[PDB]
Amino acid sequence: SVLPEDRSQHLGEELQGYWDQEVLRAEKDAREPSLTKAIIKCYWKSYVVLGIFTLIEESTRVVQPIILGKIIGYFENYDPSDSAALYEAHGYAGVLSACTLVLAILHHLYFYHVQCAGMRLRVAMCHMIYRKALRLSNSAMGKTTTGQIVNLLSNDVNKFDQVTIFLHFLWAGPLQAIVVTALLWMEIGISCLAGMAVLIILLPLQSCIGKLFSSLRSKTAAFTDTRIRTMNEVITGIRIIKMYAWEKSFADLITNLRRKEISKILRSSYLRGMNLASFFVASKIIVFVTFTTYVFLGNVITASRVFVAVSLYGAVRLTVTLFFPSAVEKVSEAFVSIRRIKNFLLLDEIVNVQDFTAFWDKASDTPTLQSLSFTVRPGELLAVVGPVGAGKSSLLSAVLGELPPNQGQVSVHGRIAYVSQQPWVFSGTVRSNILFGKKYEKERYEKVIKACALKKDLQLLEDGDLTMIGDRGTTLSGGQKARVNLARAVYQDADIYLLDDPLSAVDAEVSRHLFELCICQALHEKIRILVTHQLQYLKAASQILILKDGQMVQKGEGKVGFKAYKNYFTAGAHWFIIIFLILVNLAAQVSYILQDWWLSYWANQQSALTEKLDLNWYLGIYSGLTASTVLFGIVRSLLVFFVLVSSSQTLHNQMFESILRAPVLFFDRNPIGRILNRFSKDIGHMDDLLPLTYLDFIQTFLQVIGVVGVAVAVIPWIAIPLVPLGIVFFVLRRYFLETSRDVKRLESTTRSPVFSHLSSSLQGLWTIRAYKAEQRFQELFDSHQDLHSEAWFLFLTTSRWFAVRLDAICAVFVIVVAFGSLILAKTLDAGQVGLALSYALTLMGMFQWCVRQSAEVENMMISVERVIEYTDLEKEAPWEYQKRPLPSWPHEGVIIFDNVNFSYSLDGPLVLKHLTALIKSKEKVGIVGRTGAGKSSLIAALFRLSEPEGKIWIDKILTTEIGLHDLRKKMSIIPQEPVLFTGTMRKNLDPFNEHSDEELWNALEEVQLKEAIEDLPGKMDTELAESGSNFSVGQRQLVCLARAILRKNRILIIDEATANVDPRTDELIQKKIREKFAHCTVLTIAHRLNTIIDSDKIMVLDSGRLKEYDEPYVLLQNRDSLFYKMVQQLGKAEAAALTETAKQVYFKRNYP
């Protein structure tokens, strides 16, 4: 496990101490505090000492070219007799080999420790972020959604890992440049400055690119976040989007977000491609200008000078034109993270109640609670009652102390428990979610479980109450998680219970069972302040408080094959472009090798010669080799991005069109998060990291092949050692790779519980903060953070274990080239050896990176496969057929079912059979029956959500013989759950612009909603809150009624919806629906039978068969009818009223 100096608690507490200290100094000054200053003051002392590695390592990198000059010098002055020289030359090859091993170790030590340093910063920052989140002020939480905080950990803090890697090169790079300039000066004189002048033009330009890249990346994130939030509501709402046929509107909305987003990605990618192209060509330019100026100044090319100089510039090429720019960009990216984090860190952060008045926000036109005056004492039940918005839940929040008085006073005695109306549940076992860290005891537990009506589900769960649960309770039903949430509070045996209408979360039988056995009986000794709409229970309450107008008013995977690679490339461009993509890659490297070979050839030719070389020839071909290198290096870089970004564009469009036409069965099988991960996570890789990692891999891979090719071209005998040395690499790689994918698997699975704990906590915050549970919930995060730290730690160490041994076989290659040249020295010339050795030394950093990036590519291809499979989903029958209805159709509104059979899957059971019925024009019909009898399947048949067997007719057209959008648009659905989609009210009422603004207000008047919209500052064009949060559920259902009122249609289907409205407004829309749709034929699924008893017929489903379909009075006068038995099951008063109503209405409807 992770040792104490890396453990979450210790490591986050340290930086927090410096943050609090910096706040105090800023407050003593005038200035705003700086989180960057706190980080430096925390970590500088341990980070600076790592600079010793870079100091010694870079000193070695400048010495190693000087040794190489003395080895090459043996071939220039060669004499086969003079053994004393031969022994000395063997001495330098030993020193050069020692340099190579020392340099390899120092490089691995430095890069190891800076990567630990970055890990610690991340771990400390996550601890700070989570510690803040518990304490956020209840009003200041309203301006930052849970997903925005979770994005801090997911995206923003993961930058700090990268920041620490390159910072030392901000000084070591420039200093090395100065030293390298001084070294070159002794070797090639003033011509040194020509190469440095290029270098000091590159430095600003590459730094500006890094700044401008960061700005584009920041401006892109807004579109990506908007696309993901929109795509989340598409995937979550997909049945409603289908039934309204609104697919065209979300296609347009996602299309244009993606079209904006992809344009910034392209530009961004070209910038980043230009940066990495610069690193490729930089030395080739620097060397070109240096030796071009050198020969115009009258100097002559000699092998020793060239390859020493080439090797020195190679040092500068890493530090100044790769590592220094990488620092600037990653520091730039750091500050955007620090800025967003700082803004979060600076966010705001017996019972008696008398004169109590309070504001949730002083900008409110009134206090949000006012003048409350009541008290309650042990043994009493207080019921809190009143309309919507009367402040009932605010009263509980006041007694809980989350809402302090602006006037009046509150006091409480004994232990407090609070139960929120929305259920909350976390991971662990469901019993653990009930115990909440208390000790288990059967004797209290069984009493709690039976009083909470919860026993049956804890038996039927697949491992009972020891079933493991998801971090937000997604593994439980609403009624289960509600009772689990209540059972937790009831287990606490508290003295004051604050109950925010948990009874509203469950069915009426369960509600009274909870009220009787728990609230009345088990809690009998205790103060209960129960908010509930269960006003029918009030006879049992000891006292009753009625609120109105805000005041008191009354009192009483794993592996991927070649097929995925071919598809990924070919999806982006025609194969002709891909062949050209390969060719420019080869040509880039060939020109790159040939430029260095040309210097070697020129050095050899100068050695053969008074007479002198024709500079127009040698300097001419030199200039063409360089220019071709530059041109292909640029084009190669850009074209990789063009193809791979175009591939992501094509695969997104194909995937999105598939998900739109995919049948609902696809979403019944795959949970929402698993689909959305393709769009957010997998396409995120394809847009960003994957194209860069391909270019990074391809560019290094070709250079490794270039080094080995150069060596075998000069010293063919190397092919003999290279066979064993190759075999060793294959065995080593084979052995590593399997453990490599084990730790990448382990790393992934250990990361996700961290983010899932933050989101779990943020939803539950009114619970965990109530029971004083902040300390325990910190240690839970520290545990998950610590377990992830092990897998990350193992990933780091295993990566270095591998890389160290790859550098051992690289060092054997260098040793073979260095001594092999001295053994074979009769046969090969100084410029050949200088070429071969110079190339061999470059291998040391390069080869281990090439082989590790290979695994990165392989690992990310799993994302590519996971999206390609979604391009191949089965499709619904098309939107419009070759046959199409006449525009007058439908016109009567006949529907017929004839021998209809339905199942949700072809291998699934039938859930409607032989269903055969007529629905006449302007007739009114209700659907009734048992739970699971098939009621929901009747909608699914008629909308063809799954294709029925048999015949369905609408106005004598078979619904199978017309397009889905012909059918779906000519019907109107009022769904049970409302949805308001993000956007304006105008879009939510009309996404296609076919109703006039006059008509839209006429609709908004007829639903009696206009005034509350005119109170909004932008009126109909105002942006609604996410999910409609600025409206209650009943208010949102008014907007669904408005859509149906606007869309003129003959046939209306009502999905049991109005019973979810508040009773004083359920009755209102029930009245409106009778008024407005008098001209329609009407279908209505309903539980609250009193809402349909008037209808001309009712349909009763027993189980998959339509057993009754008749006039409701004619049903009820059959006392043996299922419909009678159902109303008889409601209760005597209900059955009397219903039967009386049926008799009266049936008589009246027989009079005409």
Ligand SMILES: CCCCC[C@H](O)/C=C/[C@H]1[C@H](O)CC(=O)[C@@H]1C/C=C/CCCC(=O)O
């Ligand atoms: C972030 C760099 C992206 C581009 C890299 C480029 O394609 C290759 C650079 C090679 C170069 O040829 C020699 C060398 O040492 C580089 C690899 C080092 C990268 C830093 C992390 C090293 C380590 O962790 O061991």
